[PDB]
């Protein structure tokens, strides 16, 4: 039972129709929300209290759990939690999102230390995704992001497609209808190359990542090629900075990206909800010590203001029933 008036109450189980993500009543939906930073790095930032503030005060529709596979404390490392205990932690966060009625992305966050080819994480990715899809089959509010940012010159769409064709059957044997979001080459830029040979599965979307200090028209044009060839795109990560996550903020270029996404009804998730002293972090340093989840940085202020706009969906109605 999702809480009255919440994003999941309004839209129910989402699916993909052509290039558009739609609600349980078949209406186009654009979701807006926030990504975690590394969970092992900022655990004080990801609690019932902090997510309650994100929902009630920042008006988010969706939260993304960035589960690093590598670097210190990554899922594959057994440096912070055992793999099965990390699963239990993730499950707790998924349940908090359910209690608040927001969507939750489980993100297998490949990036560095060789994980740039997601195939090189399969010894852990297969049992991870087997577990998560079995555990969360009956959870209407989860989305499965199977490989954050494939990268490397050696990592082509053919290689990412082979990874996806290994993991998606493992998910779909347990959870037939849940949306799967598939990363693309060159740090989830090459959606136009994925569009040349798309996956044959239903309810699949393709990842686009941008950073407004780095990516401009060229990447929007690549994305438009993918859209014109019939792919549904999801911006599961973007920043207001250059791609490193620090330095200047570029709000004029981000406004261009926001207008562009709005016109195409493309969902977006901002990097990051954390109080690291870098300019892409949405909280001021020390906010996790004080517990003041509205003590925003310059970037957080800008994103919270975008989140405060009218919802980019229309309720499925039937408010006279519990959902």
Author numbering: 48 to 370
Report text from the authors:
Here, we report a detailed characterization of AGa, an uncultured Bacteroidetes-affiliated genotype that is predicted to be cellulolytic, albeit via an unknown mechanism. Taking meta-omics and enzymology analyses into consideration, we propose a non-classical cellulose degradation mechanism that involves the utilization of multi-modular enzymes that are secreted via the Bacteroidetes-specific T9SS.
Cel5C contains two GH5 domains (Cel5C_N and Cel5C_C) that have 45% sequence identity to each other, and low similarity to their closest homologues, which consisted of individual GH5 domains (from single GH-containing proteins) from the known cellulolytic Bacteroidetes species Sporocytophaga myxococcoides (40–50% sequence identity) and Saccharicrinis fermentans (38–56% sequence identity). Comparing specific activities revealed Cel5D and the individual N-terminal GH5 domain in Cel5C (Cel5C_N) as the most active. Similar to the relative activities on CMC, Cel5C_N and Cel5D were the most active, releasing mostly cellobiose and some glucose from Avicel. In comparison, Cel5C_N generated ~ 800 μM of cellobiose from 1% Avicel in 24 h. The enzymes thus cleave Glc(6) by binding the substrate to subsites − 3 to + 3, producing Glc(3), and to − 4 to + 2 or − 2 to + 4, to produce Glc(4) which is further degraded to Glc(2). The inability of the otherwise highly active Cel5C_N to degrade decorated hemicellulose substrates (e.g. xyloglucan) was supported by structural characterization studies, which resolved the structure of Cel5C_N to 1.57 Å. The structure displays a (β/α)8-barrel fold, typical to GH5 enzymes, although a comparably narrower active-site cleft was observed, similar to that of GH5 enzymes that specifically accommodate linear polysaccharides, such as cellulose.
